């Protein structure tokens, strides 16, 4: 009943709301979606059935999408190119701002390498990739500020700004590496791994308040709670790979985990209360207060405005 | 008292799947005889690893054979313990 | 929606044969100007030429792509009794030049992956040679392992795509020789493990006319096999193996379809990925597609005009 | 038992027992030291190959095993090879390395192969 399902024609890989001003008591209404597994993929912007406002033909596949600010959307293509789009609200038109065509490319060989994940702290854009590379750019710089080459032989899947000038990266062999952007060396400060297992890690998230709490997800569908200072807790959850984990921004006591089996579970800390919000595969989710949106591989967008009712 | 030991540590097998073989052994020969026969069980176990093709890396065979022996011992122990419990219950 | 695309070939001379790869994105176009061009497909349907090189002085007949598991391996047979193996370095580089054949190598076919990298070449002398590369990293080394004499001028070869262990490797060999009286131009060779050699299993005596092309159909978990024979008329056969050893298991053959609708010589026969729709070419310039219904009745489902338009 | 027998014997006797047991590479080495010819070892290898050509499954597995006791030069991924073909390659390699008069080695191999007939 809560969820209103509008069927689109493109598999939805990413769903992210437009950051809302805290001072004003406004409710988030505009969110953005990115599509994959199609000949001509695209980036759409919707307003809460959701009505699409504007969309742009995105070259390649939209792997990861982050909202830099209210008017800028940073998208990572599957060809490695990291692009920034400027939203002109007055004319409802998305326009290309700045792009780094060869941000990620495999060593020596010809052809391209995919950009798995991006993270943003205006004006710093750190992008990891399948190749061992942690390229760092700036909103107005036409050049790459720093490139940690051969950082990880294995494909890196995700990235997040632990503290400042520090990034936590997960890789295909099950290793959480703490990196530092000030040290000029190309070696990780610390490497956290489960003893004996090499289960790949797909997702990583940091607690909004305390910076020492990091939650990650593996191919075994297990939620591992880590303490970067001191895995504290291993939680059995899904019976299949956990693609994305997200903490609720306003009230962190709530957590949402999406798996390919098709279950948008909700964890409530405030005895963890686990409930199935949805009745193919759920790829992404984004929550901001009482509003949540998730995109599935069944070419559908599920939007709720009364999540906690 | 009851003293059941460690589980199966399988190198190139599935610990969960060995339970079906455990139930095969747990078939009652006649009445209350959940012990199959050491002759049959041994033969079958020896033939299982032969079926597993030892191809390029054929240097693990001694280890494979020790594992067969350990499994047999554990099965025997289980059966003995079950029989003892049954006798205790009777008494 | 049948579409018509006009891709400028950029070829100075007549194109002979094109062949797709396993995953359907890379294709090789051999031409009469002694050049082999590799066209690759981008995210957009548009095709782009990536590599162009000269290969042999003799007329190149066929081009066969290997399974991607072994790498980007090509193969090209020619009039000058050679079978070259190509591989990129990261430009295509010739690794070997198989020249044991004393006559024009007419057809080259890669073995199914389960057996290994076993290139097979049939020559006009009547000898099918099955080579084998011991290590995939070194592709310059190819050792001949089996030579099968057929006593007739070979025109085409086709392996059995079946991966069932029960089905021993089988290869089919045709004969283009325009023999006035000699029949049985399609011979099937089976591999007897006991003798570790190839022996003749069945000869299709029904085919008494020159065989231009043969093609096995995927087994699809069935007891029998399907062989398409292109002669003056399209013929489909069913070889059911008999009951059951020390020798070849004899077969029982039945001709289940014979189409002379081409009214001309059928030159090429190829099945689709699932072996349901067979296509055929002819002197009329038309490609007729044949598909079976629920009652096992084969019927033509499409005809094409020369100018590219479909026949309505 | 052959252990005790080696305990009090000579070189020819050692070679004999090793070939019987199936430890061929050691027999090869011993032959070279005392300048004894390699005929015995080549013939023994041929015998095993003929046996496997037409043999039971257990024989095939034991064959795989004694190949590891010896030294297979390289690893080949071919599924169709099985133990028998691996033993063939071992013999072939041993021949190429430890070769002497050609007539002798080829002769003995071919002779033993035709114990009960074989298509070369």
Curated annotation (Swiss-Prot), chain C:
GO terms for cellular component: GATOR2 complex; kinetochore; lysosomal membrane; nuclear pore outer ring; Seh1-associated complex. Its main location: nucleus. Keywords: Cell cycle, Cell division, Centromere, Chromosome, Chromosome partition, Kinetochore, Lysosome, Membrane, Mitosis, mRNA transport, Nuclear pore complex, Nucleus, Protein transport, Repeat, Translocation, Transport, WD repeat. The GATOR2 complex is negatively regulated by the upstream amino acid sensors CASTOR1 and SESN2, which sequester the GATOR2 complex in absence of amino acids. In the presence of abundant amino acids, GATOR2 is released from CASTOR1 and SESN2 and activated. GO terms for biological process: attachment of mitotic spindle microtubules to kinetochore; cell division; cellular response to amino acid starvation; cellular response to nutrient levels; mitotic metaphase chromosome alignment; mRNA transport; nuclear pore organization; positive regulation of TORC1 signaling. One of its GO terms (molecular function) is structural molecule activity. The keyword Membrane applies. It is found in: Chromosome, Centromere, Kinetochore; Nucleus, Nuclear pore complex; Lysosome membrane. WD repeats lie at residues 10-49, 55-90, 100-141, 149-199, 206-244, 261-300. Component of the Nup107-160 subcomplex of the nuclear pore complex (NPC). The Nup107-160 subcomplex is required for the assembly of a functional NPC. The Nup107-160 subcomplex is also required for normal kinetochore microtubule attachment, mitotic progression and chromosome segregation. This subunit plays a role in recruitment of the Nup107-160 subcomplex to the kinetochore. Component of the Nup107-160 subcomplex of the nuclear pore complex (NPC). The Nup107-160 subcomplex includes NUP160, NUP133, NUP107, NUP98, NUP85, NUP43, NUP37, SEH1 and SEC13. Component of the GATOR2 subcomplex, composed of MIOS, SEC13, SEH1L, WDR24 and WDR59. The GATOR2 complex interacts with CASTOR1 and CASTOR2; the interaction is negatively regulated by arginine. The GATOR2 complex interacts with SESN1, SESN2 and SESN3; the interaction is negatively regulated by amino acids. Belongs to the WD repeat SEC13 family. PANTHER family: NUCLEAR PORE COMPLEX PROTEIN SEC13 / SEH1 FAMILY MEMBER, NUCLEOPORIN SEH1. This is Nucleoporin SEH1-B. It comes from Xenopus laevis (African clawed frog).
């Amino acid at each position: 009943d809560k969820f209103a399902a509008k069927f689109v024609s493109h598999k939805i890989s990413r769903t992210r709301w437009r950051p809302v001003s805290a001072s004003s008591l406004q409710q988030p209404d505009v969110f953005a979606t990115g599509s994959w597994d199609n000949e001509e993929n695209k980036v759409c912007v919707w307003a809460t059935d959701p009505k699409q406002l504007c969309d742009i033909k995105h070259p390649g596949d939209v792997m990861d999408m982050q909202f830099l600010d209210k008017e800028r959307i940073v998208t990572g293509s599957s060809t490695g190119t990291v692009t920034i789009f400027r939203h002109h609200e007055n004319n409802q038109t998305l326009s290309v701002n700045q792009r780094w065509e060869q941000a990620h490319y495999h060593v020596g060989s010809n052809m391209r390498a995919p950009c798995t994940a991006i993270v943003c702290s205006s004006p710093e854009i750190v992008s990891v990739g399948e190749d061992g590379r942690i390229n760092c750019f700036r909103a107005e710089s036409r050049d790459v500020l720093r490139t940690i080459d051969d950082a990880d032989s294995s494909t890196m899947h995700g990235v997040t700004f632990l503290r400042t000038t520090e990034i936590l990266t997960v890789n295909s062999v099950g290793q959480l590496k703490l990196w530092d952007l000030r040290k000029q060396g190309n070696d990780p400060t610390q490497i956290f791994s489960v003893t004996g297992e090499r289960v790949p890690l797909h997702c990583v998230d940091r607690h909004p308040n305390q910076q020492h709490v990091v939650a990650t997800g593996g191919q075994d569908g297990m939620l591992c709670i880590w303490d970067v200072r001191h895995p504290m807790s291993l939680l059995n959850a899904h019976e299949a790979e956990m693609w994305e984990v997200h903490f609720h921004p306003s009230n962190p006591d709530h957590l949402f985990t999406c798996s390919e089996d098709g279950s948008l579970w909700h964890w409530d800390a405030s005895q963890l209360e686990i409930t199935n919000l949805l009745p193919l595969s759920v790829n992404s989710l984004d929550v901001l207060g009482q509003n949540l949106v998730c995109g599935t591989d069944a070419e559908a967008i599920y939007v709720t405005r009364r999540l906690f009712s | 008292s009851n003293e059941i030991p460690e589980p199966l540590q399988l190198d190139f097998f599935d610990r969960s799947q060995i339970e079906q073989v455990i139930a095969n052994c747990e078939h009652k020969n006649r009445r209350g005889q959940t012990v199959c026969n050491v002759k049959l069980l041994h033969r079958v176990l020896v033939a299982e690893v032969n079926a597993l093709q030892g191809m390029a890396a054929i240097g693990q065979r001694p280890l494979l054979m020790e594992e067969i022996n350990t499994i047999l011992q554990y099965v025997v122990e289980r059966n003995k313990l079950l029989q003892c419990l049954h006798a205790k219950r009777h008494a | 929606m049948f579409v018509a695309r006009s891709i400028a070939a950029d070829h100075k001379d007549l194109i002979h044969d094109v062949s797709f790869d396993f995953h359907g994105r890379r294709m090789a176009t051999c031409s009469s100007d002694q050049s082999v061009k590799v066209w690759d497909k981008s995210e957009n349907v548009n095709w782009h030429c990536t590599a162009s090189w000269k290969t042999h002085s003799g007329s190149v007949w066929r081009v066969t792509w290997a399974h991607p598991e072994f790498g980007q391996v090509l193969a090209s047979c020619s009039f000058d009794r050679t079978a070259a193996v190509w591989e990129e370095i990261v430009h295509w580089v010739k690794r070997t030049t198989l020249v044991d054949s004393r006559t024009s190598v007419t057809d080259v076919k890669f073995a199914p992956k389960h057996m290994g990298l076993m290139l097979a070449t049939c020559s006009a002398d009547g000898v099918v040679r099955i080579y084998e590369a011991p290590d995939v990293m070194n592709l310059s080394q190819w050792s001949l392992q089996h030579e099968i004499s057929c006593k007739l001028s070979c025109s085409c070869i086709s392996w059995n795509p079946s991966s069932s262990r029960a089905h021993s490797p089988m290869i089919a060999v045709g004969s283009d020789d325009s023999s006035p009286n000699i029949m049985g131009k399609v011979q099937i060779y089976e591999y007897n493990e006991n003798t570790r050699k190839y022996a003749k299993a069945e000869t299709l005596m029904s085919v008494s006319d020159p065989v231009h092309d043969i093609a096995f159909a995927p087994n699809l978990g069935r007891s029998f096999h399907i062989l398409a024979v292109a002669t003056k008329d399209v013929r489909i056969f069913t070889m059911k193996p008999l009951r059951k050893s020390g020798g070849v298991t004899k077969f029982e053959n039945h001709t289940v379809a014979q189409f002379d609708n081409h009214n001309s010589q059928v030159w090429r026969v190829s099945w689709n990925i699932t072996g349901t729709v067979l296509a055929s070419s002819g002197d009329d310039g038309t490609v007729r597609l044949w598909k079976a219904n629920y009652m096992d009745n084969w019927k033509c489902i499409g005809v094409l005009k020369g100018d590219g338009n479909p026949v309505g | 038992s052959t252990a005790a027998i080696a305990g009090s014997s000579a070189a020819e006797e050692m070679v004999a027992l090793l070939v019987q047991a199936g430890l061929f590479d050691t027999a090869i080495s011993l032959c070279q030291t005392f300048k004894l010819a390699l005929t015995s070892v080549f013939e023994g290898l041929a015998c095993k190959c003929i046996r496997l050509q037409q043999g039971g499954e257990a024989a095939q597995a034991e064959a795989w095993e004694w190949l590891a006791a010896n030294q297979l030069a390289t690893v080949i991924t071919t599924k169709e090879s099985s133990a028998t073909d691996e033993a063939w390659r071992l013999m072939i390699s041993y021949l190429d390395k430890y070769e002497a008069k050609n007539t002798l080695y080829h002769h003995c191999i071919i002779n033993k192969l035709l114990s009960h007939g074989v298509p070369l």
